[model samples]
Target: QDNSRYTHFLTQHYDAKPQGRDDRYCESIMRRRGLTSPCKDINTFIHGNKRSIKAICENKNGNPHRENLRISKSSFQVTTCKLHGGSPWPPCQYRATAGFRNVVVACENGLPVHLDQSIFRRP
Candidate 1:
């Protein structure tokens, strides 16, 4: 089902206890997820409660251009990771930065299914 399919991505991203996380944390996630060898170019981990994140699916400020996209009403502690320099293999090096910004996510079946990383930007 699409619900379960979408749930996969939701679990692949987002983090509630990212307060003390570092760049190494990003590396660990990518390595463990096998996102190396050309790599997942950008990853943004939104730090907050699952309930608060799912609520964004019902946000009043919806994306008119793309109906399924919704912007959060409030900002979140967000950590963005990018490839700094590394081989296109596991243990790929990364640099990370944090910010307080409104997050964008794609909703499917009333659940936040994807994080729109473009809005987060890279450092």
Candidate 2:
């Protein structure tokens, strides 16, 4: 099976220097979950209402997959923030765009019979 889905990852950037003028930031792995939801998609399984999905990690980007991920709504919106507390300026002003990718799942009769072995790290 093509397990290239493991390459799905995300990253974020913050002001680590003074002036905060165009500080260089690079991509890094925030979370690596196989057979998960697509990035920025609403987690309908976790919350019935339309709530902003929390990232698996804080102060960074979240990368999810398509197997365990499903969106009741067709498309969704996601916002980014610097600190996790009160905001002084419009959060959109410092928006750092993130990318998302998804793949088709080859499942059996209403069941995920196959999964990337890397996701078994927790189990």
Candidate 3:
């Protein structure tokens, strides 16, 4: 599976990390990251090589239903953000960063593409 499309999207979109974390981290990052307006509930950011990420799709034992792949903790660094409050509009609040966890990525034609909604697990 070649996931160039989704890879490009992730690379171009949610690929930046804030210098430091703070209360206003989500407020500013969501806007700066272009996840504006109604605010995104959950988002994942990868801080590693795109090539390595893409290579995950090459695994043969990956998901059969969809071109999906799994990566262990040693493979990449990921940051996940979740909205903190009830307000869905502006001033979107997000919890502190979460990382060091495994992730499952969907792919196409040997390319890592989108993040899978399914729970992360080791291969």
Candidate 4:
């Protein structure tokens, strides 16, 4: 199979549910881009345009090479950024850093859309 049709993401799992439990699942769809895909295990499968830097969810099984996922030109920017406020920076060495400020956008069939600063932003 052509791996160019898909992009892989390493998702960090929270619960300690052994190795093969199916209870943990993440489902998302890019509404504006019209793409959807199941988050298998702790990984995200992004399938859409290979050439475009912007991830869009568009499934064209019949013509993987010909089909291109459509992305909105208007919505393009850094959705969120949170500064880590904790310990004081070590004068010359160490420094405090915000752990994980996740940027979530709706991904349809493995495509991304509607980038919002908040966690609940949907396309």
Residues 60-117, candidate 1: write the lDDT tens digits: 5344235557887867887877877656655578778877877787777888777777
Residue 6, candidate 1: Cα error in Å is: 3.4
Model 2 poorest ten-residue lDDT run: 41-50
TM-score of each: 0.81, 0.16, 0.67, 0.18
- Pitting candidate 3 against candidate 4, the one with the higher lDDT is 3
TM-score leader? 1
Off by over 4 Å in 3: 1-4, 11-18, 21-24, 60-74, 117-123
| Whole-model lDDT per candidate | 0.72, 0.22, 0.58, 0.26
What candidate 1 gets wrong by more than 4 Å, as runs, is 60-68
C-alpha-based local distance difference test score of model 4: 0.26
What TM-score does structure 2 among the candidates reach?
0.16
Ordered by lDDT, highest first, the candidates read 1, 3, 4, 2
Alpha carbon lDDT of residue 47, candidate 1? 77
**TM-score of model 4 vs. true structure:** 0.18
Q: Using lDDT, give the best candidate's number.
A: 1
Higher TM-score: candidate 2 or 4?
A: 4
- Predicted candidate 3 versus true structure: per-residue lDDT over 8-45, tens digit per residue: 65753345445555446645666776775778776666
